Design a binder for these strands. Structure first.
Ligand code: MG
Ligand code: MG
Ligand code: MG
Ligand code: MG
Ligand code: MG
Ligand code: MG
Ligand code: MG
Ligand code: MG
Ligand code: MG
Ligand code: MG
Ligand code: MG
Ligand code: MG
Ligand code: MG
Ligand code: MG
Ligand code: MG
Ligand code: MG
Ligand code: MG
Ligand code: MG
Ligand code: MG
Ligand code: MG
Ligand code: MG
Ligand code: MG
Ligand code: MG
Ligand code: MG
Ligand code: MG
Ligand code: MG
Ligand code: MG
Ligand code: MG
Ligand code: MG
Lengths: 150, 48, 110, 117, 142, 56, 103
RNA sequence: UGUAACGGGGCUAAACCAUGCACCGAAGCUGCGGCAGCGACGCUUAUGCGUUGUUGGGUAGGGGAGCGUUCUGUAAGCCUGCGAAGGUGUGCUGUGAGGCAUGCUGGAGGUAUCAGAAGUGCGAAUGCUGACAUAAGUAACGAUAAAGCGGGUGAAAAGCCC
RNA sequence: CCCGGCGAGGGGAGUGAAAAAGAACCUGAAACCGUGUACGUACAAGCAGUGGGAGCACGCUUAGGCGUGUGACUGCGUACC
């Protein structure tokens, strides 16, 4: 805290509680007793615990009928309207689309759709696999996730 | 399975103690340090 | 009907005006003015000008018969204090509070 | 995550000052004093749920004594008499009857006397 | 159902007259105190005066045992420094004999407002005559 | 010397139980000028017991 | 006419039509309870004193309500010993209405 | 300092010794209702329930189970101008920390649930800042060189002007 | 527009959804100070409550010896850290 190290008043004689620093955390305008510092909140996750978690997730999706497999999933042009349309026809709304390789059109077409995310098999994550009603995977995506989870 | 239906294993996130928060808590006032002497002080205690 | 007048931020402690407010609470306004006229108190000058304002408010605004009015309510509340400092002996300073008051007078024919 | 305490603290003080209604002076106005007043109130109250059972029995006895002596026998002998007669009416009820049914109380005295005779 | 309590506004308080002639002071006083408190009534109520009005005649003939006539001492203090005062029983009886029975009964009545009220129902006289025939006191051999 | 304990608002009010003012009860009306006035005092226009005693 | 009986470790003096609050009875509302050990029956100068119970004496009553009483606060406080606690308590009760005193 | 060496009154027993029977008397014991800890076993254990013995004063201190506050996700969801937060009442409910409902005030925000992270709970530290009491309408109004009157100005004049 | 010193301050009018936004201006807690009503209080002694409890006032239920406020009298009772 800004200010000086001057004792605000003499130790004895005035009848005030003894003081020592104008920046005492007891004091208004004083320092914060256990002031905060930037901290790194990340945690280690054991590799095996990571893959195991993914496996359990995928297995519930299946068991809850939230996992949907298809041969192909793409759109003909980077137009949000086309994806939206496809999704309506498939009776999908809130959905994670996971494909084998990145698909650019599909990615762009999906970006402004808040209930939709697109992802290549390599980039899946645990919270995405949970956070959407359905998850659609192409055969290739399955074949790649499988390889990934040994 | 949703982001608001996941919970930790029973017993895996025990709550930390918080000293000095009143009679009911059981760790009020002296905070489990007893009365007086070196060990009751901030920074107080003897070396290994 | 009831008609109000007030003097807010009057320069007197509420205590001093209350001595006077008490003299006239409940009285016919004519007897109240006589009482105030011959009460030798600064606060009697203050309260009289408020009562007179209430009387004129009642006649001018509310169509009242001044013959029929009574001081049905009168109360003095505490205003903001002005804070000052008075030097005393040996370098010591004392607080001075210059207290003020809010004077409310209500008149009515009932 | 800075936490401000006003809403919680205010509810806490108000809960105490509300229990201090009727108390004199700072006891019903000033938290620090009200709090100590409310505690002492509970202490006495705890104590006096036990005492209440003592004072009432002490009252019943005293009245039974009076009504017994009016019929010519002392409380202590009257009680002994009833015990020997296998009468089990307790002292709350006996004190009620002493006041409200003087003729039944006398009949109870005659039952006590007989069992002592 | 709450236990009965007597009520100041409906309490019945009867009048009696007692002769102190020859009675042992403190054994008379306990009975007077009993009856002035209501202890003898089934309606006895510790916060209510349920007792009776009692006239005591011939206070000047009250009796005491042992050597207390000449030796029992009444002490009192005037509130002024050094002002401790005393009289024997026998001096009390010759100066105001009523005081003997009154002092004895008052010590045996509760302390505080109600007990002071209970005392007001005691009318003690030195001689054989009272002026309360209007109250029709009933003879009480106590 | 100073208090060991804070006097109560009750006590303050008891202390003040003699502080109230008295209203004047003895006004008269001059019979010639019609003015009110303290008894045994002249009126504002300078009348007393019915005579104009002070031109002012 | 009144009668005296024991219920809930306590005794009660009652007449017909009276509602009286007892310790909780495991009897459903609208059922009739019988108290067949009655300590005293008195009707107008006739007075039956049980020794301990009156022969053929029955008090009939109807269960009218079950409920919990007003809360009572328990406070414990040991001054200067850094100790205090409270507890709140409500007591169960059954109300019965006396419908017949059979002497 | 004042009875002041029965707590008092008073007592010749209302004292002392002996025998006896009665009664009063505690948060101890019993009775009725209820909660919980530890066991045990049951109608029947996915784990709490149901029976059932017993235990349940407590400082320092160890252990266990919880309430509530702020922020992140759940949440582009749910409540909310047909009234959010906060303020003030009331009713019900929880063993309690608390919760929910609702009248009035207010006028734009709030956030179930399950998780996640803490600047997370105050009556004391001659604590810190602000606000307001008290003494009290008390002391004081600063050199004891000194004022009096007429007239004026002014809403008002002991104090300003002549 | 009105009282007031061509004041301070106020009462009307009008603006505004609102002046229960009037410039000391959102919300407007608490200490602290008042006006009004109900009940208590001038023979009475102490941590100011708690247990019992009359009476009064105010609601009930349509009576039932119940809610709320007050609290004569009475048992017990020397604050917190
Ligand atoms: Mg800072
Ligand atoms: Mg790695
Ligand atoms: Mg920690
Ligand atoms: Mg310490
Ligand atoms: Mg030590
Ligand atoms: Mg140590
Ligand atoms: Mg200087
Ligand atoms: Mg209050
Ligand atoms: Mg105690
Ligand atoms: Mg006593
Ligand atoms: Mg003696
Ligand atoms: Mg013996
Ligand atoms: Mg007991
Ligand atoms: Mg026990
Ligand atoms: Mg908030
Ligand atoms: Mg909320
Ligand atoms: Mg949480
Ligand atoms: Mg503390
Ligand atoms: Mg003084
Ligand atoms: Mg002086
Ligand atoms: Mg002076
Ligand atoms: Mg000067
Ligand atoms: Mg002026
Ligand atoms: Mg103006
Ligand atoms: Mg309009
Ligand atoms: Mg207006
Ligand atoms: Mg405001
Ligand atoms: Mg009186
Ligand atoms: Mg006193």
């Amino acid at each position: 805290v800004t200010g000086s190290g001057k004792k605000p008043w003499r130790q004895k004689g005035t009848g005030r509680a003894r003081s020592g620093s104008i920046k005492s955390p007891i004091w208004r305008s004083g320092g914060v007793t256990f002031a905060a510092r930037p901290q790194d909140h990340s945690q280690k996750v054991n590799k095996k615990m990571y893959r195991g978690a993914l496996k359990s997730i995928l297995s519930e999706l299946v068991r809850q009928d939230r996992l949907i497999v298809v041969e192909k999933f793409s759109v003909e042009a980077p137009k949000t309207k086309l994806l939206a349309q496809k999704l309506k026809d498939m009776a999908l709304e809130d959905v994670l689309i996971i494909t084998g390789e990145l698909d650019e059109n599909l990615f762009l077409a999906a970006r402004n759709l808040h209930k939709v995310d697109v992802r290549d098999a390599t980039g899946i994550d645990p919270v995405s696999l949970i956070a959407f009603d359905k998850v659609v995977m192409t055969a290739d995506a399955v074949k790649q996730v499988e390889e990934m989870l040994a | 399975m949703r982001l608001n239906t996941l919970s930790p294993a029973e017993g895996s996130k025990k709550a930390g103690k918080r000293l000095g928060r009143g009679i009911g808590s059981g760790l009020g006032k002296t905070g489990g340090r007893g009365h007086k002497g070196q060990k009751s002080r901030s920074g107080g205690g003897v070396r290994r | 009907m009831e008609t109000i007048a007030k003097h807010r931020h009057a320069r007197s402690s509420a205590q001093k005006v209350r001595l006077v407010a008490d003299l006239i609470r409940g009285k016919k306004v004519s007897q109240a003015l006589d009482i105030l006229t011959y009460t030798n108190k600064k606060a009697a000058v203050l309260v009289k000008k408020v009562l007179e304002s209430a009387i004129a408010n009642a006649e001018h605004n509310d169509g009242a018969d001044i013959d029929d009015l009574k001081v049905t309510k009168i109360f003095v509340d505490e205003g903001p204090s002005m804070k000052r400092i008075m030097p005393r002996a040996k370098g010591r300073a004392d607080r001075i509070l210059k207290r003020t008051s809010h004077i409310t007078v209500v008149v009515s024919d009932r | 995550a800075r936490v401000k305490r006003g809403v919680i603290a205010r509810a806490r003080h108000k809960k105490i000052l509300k229990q201090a209604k009727g108390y004199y002076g700072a006891r019903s106005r000033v938290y620090r004093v009200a709090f100590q007043a409310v505690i002492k109130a509970g202490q006495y109250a705890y104590r006096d749920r036990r005492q209440r059972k003592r004072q009432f029995r002490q009252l019943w006895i005293a009245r039974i004594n009076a009504a017994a002596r009016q019929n010519g026998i002392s409380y202590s002998k009257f009680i002994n008499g009833l015990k020997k007669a296998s009468v089990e009416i307790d002292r709350k009820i006996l004190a009620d009857i002493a006041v409200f049914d003087k003729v039944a109380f006398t009949a109870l005295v005659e039952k006590a006397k007989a069992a002592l005779a | 159902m709450k236990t009965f309590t007597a009520k100041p506004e409906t309490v019945k308080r009867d009048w009696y007259v007692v002769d102190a002639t020859g009675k042992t002071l403190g054994r008379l006083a306990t009975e007077l105190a009993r009856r002035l408190r209501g202890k003898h009534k089934a309606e006895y109520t510790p916060h209510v005066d349920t007792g009776d009005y009692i006239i005591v005649l011939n206070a000047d003939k009250v009796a005491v045992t042992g050597n207390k006539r000449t030796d029992k001492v009444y002490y009192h203090h005037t509130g002024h420094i050094g002002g401790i005062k005393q009289a024997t029983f026998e001096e009390m009886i010759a100066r105001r004999p009523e005081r003997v029975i009154e002092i004895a009964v008052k010590g045996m009545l509760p302390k505080g407002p109600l007990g002071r009220a209970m005392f007001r129902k005691l009318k003690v006289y030195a001689g054989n005559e009272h002026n309360h025939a209007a109250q029709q006191p009933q003879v009480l051999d106590i | 010397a100073v208090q060991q304990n804070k006097p109560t608002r009750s006590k303050r009010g008891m202390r003040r139980s003699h502080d109230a003012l008295t209203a004047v009860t003895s006004l008269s009306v001059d019979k010639t000028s019609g003015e009110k006035h303290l008894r045994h005092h002249i009126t504002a226009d300078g009348y007393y017991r019915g005579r104009k005693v002070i031109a002012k | 006419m009144y009668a005296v009986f024991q219920s809930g470790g306590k005794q009660h003096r009652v007449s017909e039509g009276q509602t009286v609050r007892l310790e909780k009875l495991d009897i459903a509302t609208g059922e009739t309870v019988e108290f067949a050990e009655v300590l005293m029956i008195a009707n107008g100068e006739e007075v039956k004193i049980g020794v301990p119970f009156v022969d053929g004496g029955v008090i009939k009553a109807e269960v009218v309500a079950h409920g919990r009483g007003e809360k009572v606060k328990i406070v414990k406080f040991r001054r200067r010993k850094h100790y205090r606690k409270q507890q709140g308590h409500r007591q169960w009760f059954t109300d019965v209405k006396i419908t017949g005193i059979s002497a």
